[PDB]
Paper text:
[name] serves as a crucial intracellular adaptor and E3 ubiquitin ligase involved in signal transduction pathways, contributing to immune responses, tumor progression, and embryonic development. [name] is a noncanonical member of the TRAF family, with a long CC domain and distinct WD40 repeats instead of the TRAF-C domain. [name] contains a RING domain, a ZF domain, a CC domain, and seven WD40 repeats. Somatic mutations within the coiled-coil (CC) domain and WD40 repeat domain of [name] could cause brain tumors, while germline pathogenic mutations contribute to severe developmental abnormalities.
The structure of [name] CC (fragment 270–379 aa) was solved at 3.3 Å resolution by X-ray diffraction. As predicted, [name] CC forms a parallel CC trimer in the crystal, and residues E285–L377 exhibit distinct electronic cloud density and form coiled coil. Using the multi-angle light scattering (MALS) assay, we demonstrated that both [name] CC and [name] ZF-CC (fragment 221–379 aa) independently form trimers in solution. Detailed structural analysis revealed that [name] CC comprises 10 regular heptad repeats and one hendecad repeat interspersed between the heptad repeats. The helical diagram analysis revealed that the residues at the a and d positions of the heptad/hendecad repeats of [name] CC (residues in yellow in Figure 4A) are predominantly hydrophobic residues, which are mainly responsible for forming the folding core of the trimer. Charge residues in the e and g positions further stabilize the CC structure by shielding the hydrophobic core from the surrounding solution. MALS assays showed that the L322R and L347R mutants displayed significantly lower molecular weights than the wild-type [name] CC. MALS assays revealed that K346E exhibited a lower molecular weight compared to the wild-type [name] CC, while R371G did not present a significant difference in molecular weight, suggesting a weakened stability of the [name] homotrimer caused by the K346E mutation. The results showed that the Q310L mutant behaved similar to the wild-type [name] CC, while the elution peaks of the F337S and I368S variants were shifted to the right, suggesting weaker interactions between the chains of the trimer, indicating that the F337S and I368S variants likely form the trimer with lower structural stability, ultimately affecting [name] function. In conclusion, our results showed that [name] CC region formed a stable functional trimer in solution, and the formation and stabilization of the CC trimer are crucial for zebrafish embryonic development.
Author numbering:
A (entry chain C): 285 to 376
B (entry chain A): 285 to 377
C (entry chain B): 286 to 377
The structure:
């Protein structure tokens, strides 16, 4: 007869599973939070990139407009040069 | 024979464990798909960033090349004025 | 004697331990993928720091060149007026 010790052996086994499950709840919770930290880090990095990009886009536009404007001044200077070279051959 | 209710108590606990495990299957399934979306999102940002820098680098190169030609045109032009100024002191006055 | 059922529960506990053992694997991989992705982000942040400081200097260095070159353009335009003014002193 007897065999009543086995009743506790399964009761003990269920405690092992509850403890092992309790870690599983724990491990998943971090992975969730760790994932959230990365998605937050990425989204904020995206925001700083948009600003830092809009700045360099504006600077590229201001400098490139200046470059094209200076091409006009080269033509205006060249126009005045054609007049002068013709004028010097009009007399010593 | 003195506690047959325990026969059912274990059947209840096994059901608790199966559902609790079923949750773990779901949480990992969600975590897996969410992870894949992030790894894809990261991959797309890497590619789009490569372009926008390669784009602006071309503008920086073409704009700086424009400067180098314009300094040359300015240097030859400044030479052209110095030669002219030298001729003016040789002219009758 | 209900000894057939006592083993039936022992079998189910083995099923769960295997299912738990898989969960350890799935969590371990997901952990590493997070570390790899979080690693991918950090190098991307650093690479942006370098690539931005370069282009920011190039925009500043080129724009400083513009400011010097616009000065040189004004001196050139003055000397053309200088030459034309001397030619108008030959008439007079």
């Amino acid at each position: 007869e007897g065999l009543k010790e086995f009743l506790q052996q399964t009761d003990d086994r269920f405690h092992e599973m509850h403890v092992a499950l309790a870690q599983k709840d724990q491990e998943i919770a971090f992975l969730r939070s760790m994932l959230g930290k990365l998605s937050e880090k990425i989204d904020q990095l995206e925001k700083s990139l948009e600003l830092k990009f809009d700045v360099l886009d504006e600077n590229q536009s201001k400098l490139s407009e200046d470059l094209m404007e200076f091409r006009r001044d080269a033509s205006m200077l060249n126009d005045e040069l054609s007049h002068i070279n013709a004028r010097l051959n009009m007399g010593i």
